[PDB]
Structures are given as C-alpha cells and as structure tokens.
Design a binder for this molecule. Structure first.
Ligand SMILES: O=C(CO)[C@@H](O)[C@H](O)[C@H](O)CO
Ligand SMILES: OC[C@H]1O[C@](O)(CO)[C@@H](O)[C@@H]1O
Length: 560
C-alpha cells in the first residue's frame, strides 16, 4: 500500500498538509472547506490502510485515490489520462481576489481561536494561487507563519511585530515560487536531459571539492525530487526530498564543508538550508581543462564512446572552477563544445579543428559580462524605481503586444536585480544577475503562454531555455507594431490614488507609462518625461481638495 507508506515516513501533520496543497493546486477555483473535507476522508482512509495493508482499496495508486476524491470534463475520464487532465488544467494566473490582509486584531482573533483552520487556510490560499509551488518549501513557510502569529499576538503591539515578519514571508514567497516555476518548465517543456545538465552545473559550483560520481548521484536524486513535485506527486516529492537530506548530512565530508550548521537543524529547515548553502571553497591545485578536453588524443574516441558521461565530465570540471559564471553561461559553453566536437570529429584533422575550441568561449563570456556591467551602473546611476521605469519602456518597446499587468509585473521584477545583485563583488554579480533574470523571463514566458499575443515572445520562450535571456536582450523595438488607439477608459481616475500605498502608487504610474509608450511606440525619453510629468502634476493638484472627484474628472475629460 502506497498511501500508508507515505503516511508513515511523512507523519500525519505533514501528510495532511501536503494533501491539502495538492488539492488546492489540482482545483484552484474550488471553495476552502470543500477541500478540507476531501483531505479528511483521505487521511482517515489512510489510517485504515496504515492499520491493515490488505484493507479494501489500499493497493490503489495515489493518482486513483486523489482523483476519485477530487471528482466528488476531467472526471469523465480515467487514469492515467485523468491525472494528466488535472495537471494540464493548472493556471499560473487564476481569476482570484487579491488577498487583502484585514485588521490585525481580527487575525489574532481567528489565530488563537482556531489555529489548525488558520494554518490550513494559509496553505490553501498560497497553493491555489501558486499551483507549482515547491510543496516541501511551503510546509516551511507554514512553520514560520505560525511562529510569527504565535509570537506577536502575545506582544505589546501586534501590528508592529507581525506585519514586517509577514511581509518578509510574502517576499520570500514570490521568489521561491518563481524559482520552482522555472524548474517545472525546464522539465515539462524541455525534458530530463536539460534539467540534469542544469543540475550538474549548479551542484558542481556548490560542491567543487566533490567528485563526479558524487555529483551524478545527487543529480539523479535532485531531478527525481523535482520530477515528482512538478508532476504533482507531492508525497513522494517530500519523502524523497527528506531522504536526499538524510543522505547529504551523512556524507558531508564527501560533498562539502559548509553543511555543518544546516545538518544540525530540524527536517523542514535543513532542506531549505541545504538548497541555499554558500559555494564551498574550490579545490587547491586544479589542472586546467585543456589537459583531457583539448590536448588529448582520445578526445573524439571518448565523445563517441561515452558522450553523455564525457559531456557530463566537462560541464562538471568547467563549473567547479567557475563559481563566477552563471549556470546559463556554462550551459551555453557546454553546448558550444559538444557542437564543436560534432563537426571536428567528422573531419580529416580533428585534433586541429577542435584545439581552437576554448577560443569560441570568449564572445559568449563577454556578452553577459558587459550587459551586467552596463545596467548595474545605470542602476547605481538611477535607483530601483527609476531603474524599473527604464526596463519598462525598453521591454514594452521590444514586445508591445504583451498585456500591461504582465509587462509591469515582469519589468518591476527585472528591476529587483540591480538591487539584489549589483551590490555583490563582480565574481558574484553574474550568477546572481543572470540566474535571477531567467526566473523573471520564465515568468513572462509562462504568463504570456496562457494567451499568446506576441510571436517575438513565443519564439524566445520555445527556442532554448539557456538562450532565453540573449534572445530577449537582442530584441529591439517592434517596428511592425500598429501604434495603439488612445482610450478614455484608462487615464480615467480614482480619487483613491491619493491614498494608495507607495507601492500601489508606483504601480499605477508604471501602468500609465506602459499605456503611454504603447500609444507612441516611437517616442523620445524627453517626450515621455514630459507627458509623465504632466500626469504627475495633474495628480498632485486633484489630490488637493474641495472636489477631488470632479478635479480628476474635469482633467480626465479635459484631456478627452
Ligand atoms: O543559487 C543558489 C544559491 O543561493 C540558489 O538560488 C539555488 O539555485 C536554488 O536554491 C536551487 O534551485
Ligand atoms: O535545488 C538543489 C538543492 O536542493 C536540494 O536538493 C534539497 O532540495 C539540495 O540537495 C540541492 O543542493
């Protein structure tokens, strides 16, 4: 019996949780206490099965069991095609109430009142709004969300304690979800082989002192974890994730010397810890690569005789000595090498055709290097908010078809890179910057995917996950684009704008900026600053009273 096996390793409180999440992800439109009920039957059923293995129906796969409960289009359909239906029905941008957080006291009132139903409503709300969210990490966000309600409601002021701590959570939230979203699309749209290469590369940076047979082992385990998570098999996902942790913590003199403190922590924490560890110090006296990947006579023998292992060794030896290269770059480097080997071994003097191989990395390394210096400067010379507006006009010009909210959301998150990365010392700038940019570009990739409107985006999104960034960078303004038709149903206003949070306040402006730029695809910096400055002036007026509602209306209409 599978269920039971999972109920035992995971324990109940986790089990109950992981099943809840899976139901929220499977059915994002369905009511809360409909799902809690479904979770309850299953848990109680899994107890009968935990008792007697033979108990009727306990031999059934998790898919059959979860699918049946769910069904109490996709249901008039049987396993395995049925499960594929739920998975294929997942929605990255679901029509659901923004999640406004009401008066704190009331949150402490519901928390101390009913504390199981209050953590279960948090899982349920994150999960249906983030249908690909790394299941085990959620549990960890839930532990912390409690620790915060527990340790603020019993304090002087509960607004000053809680809110910051809870804001720090929502942030880590977003970022973790976007990171997991990108692993799932690597597997789903591009297949295991690409993910494994990504893994080989990243782990090898983290664990440079570790050997290739050790990195491979961790790579199969890691990909197995994610395969299941991204496929919605959360229970096995959590189980196998815990096991990787038990494993890393036992062999940590074979893997890295940075695990001490992570591996003394409780299960939920250690995994989260391990996944964030600092790169270990790269080994002492390391032979340049050329040795066996260029100088050798068996070069072409080995690539023919064992390509995957061989190209595995390369990426690994190259990665372990470039913690200052982004994973994307190294993956490009790796592809450029296999491709070269491809032509050279086919020709009359292979050793000669391929000895210039390392000399085709030059331009590939250069491109990201400059781009990261240029805008890391523009941003010290501009600041985040002003940096975001610049990205916002650039990317709108590139792909003006994409929806405003997507444009605003992506571009702002693109701005968060200067802030996040440009502080770092140059040998950390690049993996930060570029590895961060892939996550936010994938967001755009998956947000646009629900309803494609721009073939320039569709193309860069399907061509190669690795090339995705350069593909976006190299785009220039869209001169085919039919300039947009000015609409009064826009710069219509809303005396609310006077009382918006600083965030919401910047978000309305940026949203107006997009519109603007979409109205004149070709327009100066100097004419946008002009038209924007007008709008700002108009708003500062009407936010000073008598009749704000009519002020906004007259000037709305007196711009009509
Ligand atoms: O690069 C790092 C190290 O901070 C992490 O972002 C890592 O890539 C992630 O934990 C695995 O998905
Ligand atoms: O994302 C990769 C990292 O996450 C873990 O698999 C645990 O989830 C660690 O083994 C690995 O270092």
């Amino acid at each position: 019996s599978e269920v039971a096996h999972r109920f035992k390793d995971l324990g109940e409180e986790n089990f109950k949780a992981l099943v809840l999440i899976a139901f929220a992800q499977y059915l994002q439109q369905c009511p809360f206490e409909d799902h809690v009920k479904l979770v309850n039957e299953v848990t109680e059923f899994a107890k009968t099965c935990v008792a007697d293995e033979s108990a009727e129906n306990c031999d059934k796969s998790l898919h059959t069991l979860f699918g049946d409960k769910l069904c109490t289009d996709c249901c008039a359909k049987q396993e395995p095609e049925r499960n594929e239906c739920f998975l294929q029905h997942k929605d990255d941008n679901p029509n659901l109430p923004r999640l406004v957080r009401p008066e704190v006291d009331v949150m402490c009132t519901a928390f101390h009142d009913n504390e199981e139903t209050f953590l279960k409503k948090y899982l349920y709300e994150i999960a249906r709004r983030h249908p690909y969210f790394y299941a085990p990490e959620l549990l960890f966000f839930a532990k912390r969300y409690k620790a915060a309600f527990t340790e603020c409601c019993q304090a002087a002021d509960k607004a000053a304690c809680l809110l910051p701590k809870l804001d720090e959570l929502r942030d880590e939230g977003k970022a973790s979800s976007a990171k997991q979203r990108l692993k799932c699309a690597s597997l789903q749209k591009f297949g295991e082989r690409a993910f494994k290469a990504w893994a080989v590369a990243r782990l090898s940076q983290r664990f440079p002192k570790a050997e290739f047979a050790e990195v491979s082992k961790l790579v199969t385990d890691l990909t197995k974890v994610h395969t299941e998570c991204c496929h919605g098999d959360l229970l096995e996902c959590a189980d196998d994730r815990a096991d990787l942790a038990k494993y890393i913590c036992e062999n940590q003199d074979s893997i890295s010397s940075k695990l001490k403190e992570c591996c003394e922590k409780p299960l939920l924490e250690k995994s989260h810890c391990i996944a964030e560890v600092e790169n270990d110090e790269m080994p002492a006296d390391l032979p340049s690569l050329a040795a066996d990947f260029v100088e050798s006579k068996d070069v072409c023998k080995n690539y023919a005789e064992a390509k995957d292992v061989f190209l595995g060794m390369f990426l690994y030896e190259y990665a372990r000595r470039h913690p200052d290269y982004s994973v994307v770059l190294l993956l490009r480097l790796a592809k450029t090498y296999e491709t070269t080997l491809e032509k050279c071994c086919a020709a009359a003097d292979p050793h000669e055709c391929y000895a210039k191989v390392f000399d085709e990395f030059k331009p590939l390394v250069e491109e990201p290097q400059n781009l990261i210096k240029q805008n890391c400067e523009l941003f010290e010379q501009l600041g985040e908010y002003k940096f975001q507006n610049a990205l916002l006009v650039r990317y709108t010009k590139k792909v003006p078809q994409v929806s405003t909210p997507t444009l605003v959301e992506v571009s702002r998150n693109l701005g968060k890179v200067g802030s996040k990365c440009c502080k770092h010392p140059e040998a950390k700038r690049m993996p930060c910057a570029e590895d961060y940019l892939s996550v936010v570009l994938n967001q755009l990739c998956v947000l646009h995917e629900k309803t494609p409107v721009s073939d320039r985006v569709t193309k860069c999104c399907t061509e190669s996950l690795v090339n995705r960034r350069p593909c976006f960078s190299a785009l220039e303004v869209d001169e085919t684009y039919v300039p947009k038709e000015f609409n009064a149903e826009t710069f219509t206003f809303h005396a609310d704008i006077c009382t918006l949070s600083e965030k919401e306040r910047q978000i309305k402006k940026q949203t107006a900026l997009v519109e603007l730029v979409k109205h004149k695809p070709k327009a100066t910096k100097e004419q946008l600053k002009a038209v924007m400055d007008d709008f700002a002036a108009f708003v500062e007026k009407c936010c000073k009273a008598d009749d704000k509602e009519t002020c906004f209306a007259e000037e709305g209409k007196k711009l009509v």
